[PDB]
């Protein structure tokens, strides 16, 4: 079963996640732009801007992406 | 073709390597390596097709990818070969690797921008074009997101693992390949990506020239593992869905198999590689 959806403002940016590059079952958006994310076999997550650094949830991956971006707009993949 | 530890390059060899890298960038060829890597990063999944990452072919795939890149460098300057970064030995920001005559240093704390060396954005010679993070300058934060590079003792524990890889042949596997890649265990290759930070922490990690030196040392560790376990070899060896078996061909090239890449000495040697 997919993780739950989420919607919050994190560090001034809107991050959204929902159940739905790979056939991969969950979508995340930063200010409306989709961020590629992926789930690992042990249930951890990564995103294309933190791809070598597993975190426990898709919200954690979205937050890690906002941290990485330092205010920059995400470009669509 | 001899691949040398970066720490050992002469000033002339660093000059020639940097110039060849910058020319691949200027001509447009470099960025397609970045693009190829990101496409595989994004499509390799633990429960579906997986070729470049999180799979047994992680090591031959990167071996062929680095050969393609080294052949492109040699098309510019036939004397140049890919050096390797032994991050277990050269483990601080003070390593000559990160000096302004080679790769330049860490990024400044505000925006992570690299401010010195040949690849600093201010030179006009290193636009970041293939990107997800919209910024167009090289970034790094050495030791920012993880405190330490792997040590020789940690590498040795991974080198001692006898099985090349194991079912289910993905990021959950026991075995040498997944320990070296770093998804399980004390974590070698993934941790180095995180330690450099900036683009090296992302799916467009070849945007940083250190990518190649990191993977050339990962590649060297496969060669070391082989010398430690001459009795052990690539697996799987046939009939595995979604995974590249030993004699199956690999995308994107389609014309080469893990079998064709196990013996690096068909293509290059190392400055030093311990015997069995
Ligand atoms: O994996 O780069
Ligand atoms: Cu991915
Ligand atoms: Cu890598
Ligand atoms: Cu023996």
What labels would you give this structure?
heterodimer, A: alpha+beta, four-stranded antiparallel beta sheet, three-stranded antiparallel beta sheet, 1 helix, globular, B: mainly alpha, di-copper center containing domain from catechol oxidase, two-stranded parallel sheet, binds copper (II) ion, oxidoreductase/metal binding protein, tyrosinase, catalytic mechanism, OXIDOREDUCTASE-METAL BINDING PROTEIN complex, dimeric
Structure write-up:
The complex is a heterodimer of chains A (77) and B (276). By secondary structure, chain A is an alpha+beta fold. Chain A has 1 helix and 7 strands; from the N terminus they run E-E-E-E-E-E-E-H. In chain A, the strands form 2 sheets. A 4-stranded antiparallel sheet of chain A has the order 1-2-3-4, with helices on one face. In chain A, a hairpin with a 6-residue loop joins strand 2 (13-19) and strand 3. Chain A starts with 5 loop residues before the first strand and ends in an 8-residue tail after the last helix. Chain B is mainly alpha-helical and 276 residues long. Chain B has one domain (1-276): di-copper center containing domain from catechol oxidase (Orthogonal Bundle). Chain B has a two-stranded parallel sheet with strand order 1-2. Chains A and B meet through strand 7 of A and helix 2 and helix 6 of B. Bound molecules: peroxide ion and copper (II) ion (3 copies). Peroxide ion is lined by residues 53, 205 of chain B. The PDB classes it as oxidoreductase/metal binding protein. Keywords: tyrosinase, catalytic mechanism, OXIDOREDUCTASE-METAL BINDING PROTEIN complex.
């Amino acid at each position: 079963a997919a993780p739950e959806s989420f919607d919050e403002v994190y560090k001034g940016r809107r991050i959204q996640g929902r159940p739905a590059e790979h056939g991969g079952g969950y979508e995340v958006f930063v200010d409306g732009v989709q961020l590629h994310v992926m789930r690992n076999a042990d249930g951890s997550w990564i995103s294309v801007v933190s791809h070598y650094d597993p975190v426990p949830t898709p919200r954690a991956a979205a937050r890690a992406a906002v941290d990485e971006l330092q205010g920059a707009p995400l470009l669509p993949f | 073709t001899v691949r040398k530890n970066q720490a050992t390059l002469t000033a002339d060899e660093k000059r020639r390597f940097v110039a060849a890298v910058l020319e691949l960038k200027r001509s447009g060829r470099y960025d397609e390596f970045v693009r190829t890597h990101n496409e595989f990063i994004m499509s390799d999944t633990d429960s579906g097709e997986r070729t470049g990452h999180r799979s047994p072919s992680f090591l031959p795939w990167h071996r062929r990818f680095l050969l393609d890149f080294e052949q492109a460098l040699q098309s510019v300057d036939s004397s140049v070969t890919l050096p390797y970064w032994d991050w277990s030995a050269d483990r601080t920001v003070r390593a000559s690797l990160w000096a302004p005559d080679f790769l330049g240093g860490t990024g400044r704390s505000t925006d992570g921008r690299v401010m010195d060396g040949p690849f600093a954005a201010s030179t006009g010679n290193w636009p970041i074009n293939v990107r997800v993070d919209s910024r167009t300058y090289l970034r790094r934060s050495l030791g920012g997101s993880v405190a330490e590079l792997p040590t020789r003792a940690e590498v040795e524990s991974v080198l001692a693992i006898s099985a090349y890889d194991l079912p289910p042949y993905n990021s959950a596997s026991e075995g040498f390949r997944n320990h070296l890649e770093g998804w399980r265990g004390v974590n070698l290759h993934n941790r180095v990506h995180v330690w450099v930070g900036g683009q090296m922490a992302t799916g467009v990690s070849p945007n940083d020239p250190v990518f190649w030196l990191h993977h050339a040392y990962v590649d060297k560790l496969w060669a070391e593992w082989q010398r430690r376990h001459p009795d052990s070899a690539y697996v799987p060896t046939g009939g595995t869905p979604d995974v590249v078996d030993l004699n199956e061909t690999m995308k994107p090239w389609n014309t080469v198999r893990p079998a064709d890449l196990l013996d690096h000495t068909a293509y290059y040697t190392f400055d030093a590689l311990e015997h069995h």
